[PDB]
Symmetry: C2
Subunit: 264 residues, 2 copies
Amino acid sequence: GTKYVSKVPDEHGFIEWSTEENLIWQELFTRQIACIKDKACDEYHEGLAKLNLPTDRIPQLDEVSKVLKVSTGWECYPVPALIGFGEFFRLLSEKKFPVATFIRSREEMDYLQEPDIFHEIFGHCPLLTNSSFANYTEAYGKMGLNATKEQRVFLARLYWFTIEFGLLDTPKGLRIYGGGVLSSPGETDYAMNNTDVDRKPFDILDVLRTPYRIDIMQPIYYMLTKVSDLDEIRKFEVDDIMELVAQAEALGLHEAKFPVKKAS
Amino acid sequence: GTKYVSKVPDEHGFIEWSTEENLIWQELFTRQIACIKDKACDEYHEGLAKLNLPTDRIPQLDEVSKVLKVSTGWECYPVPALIGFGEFFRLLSEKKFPVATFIRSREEMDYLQEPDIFHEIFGHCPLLTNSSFANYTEAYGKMGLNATKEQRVFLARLYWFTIEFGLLDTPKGLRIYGGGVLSSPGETDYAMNNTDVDRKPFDILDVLRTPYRIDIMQPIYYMLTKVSDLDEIRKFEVDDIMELVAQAEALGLHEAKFPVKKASLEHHHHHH
Ligand SMILES: [Fe+3]
Ligand SMILES: [Fe+3]
């Protein structure tokens, strides 16, 4: 693998990216924009218009935050390369999106497990300019603040099937809003085109009961009809979310798909 | 149960299986006999007819060995613990097929990573009555006896794509000879039916160059046209095989498919 470390912003929040690091961003950006023109959802494209990201260099977090602040009151928040659940929920609940300030190696161009700066800024930040998606993400952070270990595992699952791997069943066809898909050519092609994979209508109980593995091709995706469908879960009180978590736990998980059974 | 303490044969070689263990065998057998009806290759069905396995209890190793002995000179060889690569090669070179003396728990019915007695007896043993498949397995064991650590990695890759996950491209459609597929409903359905996987004609150099991961749905399969196609590989001298390994290394591995890139690297301490 590779062990990455956040670059430390100077006293102004400035990070000195190298010409090599900018070239890696440029390659990732130009391969992906091409991948998603007719695959990312309309809401995500509108978010790219609002961010107006540089195509040829890694943006300073302040340039992204300026836009997030205008649009939904959010900001990018520089963190170390690994943070715990506690910190993650807390920052989201304060409308601070954690961003580790490193970019992948050349060797790991096609895939890495760690979320790097291209994954966070290209994959997730465009939708944080969308009120529905940003307010949902804020509500998600709140959900986790007083969650037990067991509750946090159900919450991570809701996150996985929405913010990371969410799809839409739109009037113009299947589209993508999950950032895990958006930032990856391999994930985009599989989510859009794989013949046999299960794409199911979103149902919060079904989602909370779905086991998943992070290092396999996903055998199940859930589809909203539009990003604003997240308003329904946004609107639940935390107590309502925990009742749904208690329902999932009491029922136990759905039987795992075969690839999930198999994963180490 | 079978966890923590795998079974040791008594002084007569007899293993006492519980009514629950026998019921697990019966459920595994009945479900698989239905899964492989027109999917397992003819050579495999012929081997089932030779073994006459019991459908409702775990067979004693001797009841299988006695039939392997008369058909191809093979036997089942009980192992109470995973053995090393060196010992695995040595056993195959002696026409001894290692069989772990345990059956999966009920909870693990549909899948377990460690090969159990059902995987070995149902998945592999019917083909060990077939002369082409048996002779190839013996030759494979001979290939590893003086192999280096890296050469053994290439040999395991060859084994994976033949004995474990081999398919046939037949005039009657796609069939299965790999034991990892034959003993699993999930593997059988995916190997026969999944439309996006890459099913390639067998070529030994391609096979030696293909990265793979044990814990994922396989992105690539290799197809013979008949089990007796293994005769071509069996006939090589060990030096010929090591020449092919060196050629593979000179070319380097094929680029990994995306699922292989994504999978967790895993060290295998024991042989498939
Ligand atoms: Fe992400
Ligand atoms: Fe096997």
